[PDB]
């Protein structure tokens, strides 16, 4: 995410990394101890997840491995439009929870009051490159009529956009199926955006979680 700073070390407990190959793929949202949410677009065969996680390079105590034993991509997900771009992990075994890992509750209702909101993620940040310590930044929700009119189109019911007209705050490369967090909930999931990454003019684009409450209990409670 560019324009950010790093995180406060203890705020991001339900923060997850989705690697592939030993390497950083996306990010992802503890929900359940046994479940992680992310966008279906990271979907890749031999996803990891790491949990607890600060500083990708560091072994960290409060860090736990998992390997992903299901991936369920929602049955509507559109690839070309982006549309229901979301997915549930399960992982091999249910997280140990602590105070550094611990699920994020979901926004149930799609007319919250909260608008301000977090961002999260080790994706790209403003100088080109990737961060070892993971990126935090505050942004707020933009109104569907303003996302419409900044992608014509190309916003569904399932789509939440925010931004930040002010520096440009904003989701990027690698952020992808992390979190927007408003008001303590889980709202949306970094999903796209502008290229370059850069809200100034054209705002980040979530998938709309509370869209999926019912998807997401009906496939925990399988």
């Given at each position: 995410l560019v324009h950010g700073g790093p995180?406060?070390?203890?705020?991001?407990?339900y923060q997850?990394?989705?690697?592939?190959?030993?390497?950083?793929?996306?990010?992802?949202?503890?929900?359940?101890?046994?479940?992680?949410?992310?966008?279906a677009h990271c979907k890749k065969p031999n996803l990891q997840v790491f949990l607890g996680k600060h500083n990708l390079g560091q072994q960290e105590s409060s860090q736990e491995q998992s390997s992903v034993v299901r991936a369920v991509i929602h049955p509507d997900y559109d690839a070309a439009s982006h549309d229901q771009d979301i997915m549930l992990l399960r992982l091999a075994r249910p997280a140990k929870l602590s105070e550094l890992i611990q699920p994020l509750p979901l926004e149930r209702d799609c007319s919250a009051q909260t608008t301000s909101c977090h961002?999260?993620?080790?994706?790209?940040?403003?100088?080109?490159?990737?961060?070892?310590?993971?990126?935090?930044?505050?942004?707020?929700?933009?109104?569907?009529?303003e996302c419409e009119h900044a992608?014509?189109?190309?916003i569904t019911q399932n789509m939440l956009c925010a931004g930040d007209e002010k520096y440009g705050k904003d989701?990027?490369?690698?952020?992808?199926?992390?979190?927007?967090?408003?008001?303590?909930?889980?709202?949306?999931?970094?999903?796209?955006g502008n290229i370059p990454c850069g809200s100034k003019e054209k705002p980040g684009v979530y998938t709309?979680?509370?869209?999926?409450?019912?998807?997401?209990?009906?496939?925990?409670q399988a």
């Open positions: 995180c406060d070390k203890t705020s991001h407990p997850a990394a989705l690697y592939t190959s030993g390497h950083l793929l996306c990010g992802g949202v503890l929900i359940h101890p046994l479940w992680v949410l992310t966008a961002i999260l993620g080790w994706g790209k940040t403003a100088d080109g490159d990737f961060p070892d310590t993971i990126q935090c930044a505050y942004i707020h929700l933009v109104s569907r009529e992608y014509p189109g190309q989701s990027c490369q690698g952020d992808s199926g992390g979190p927007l967090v408003c008001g303590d909930h889980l709202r949306g999931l970094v999903s796209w709309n979680v509370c869209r999926y409450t019912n998807w997401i209990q009906k496939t925990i």
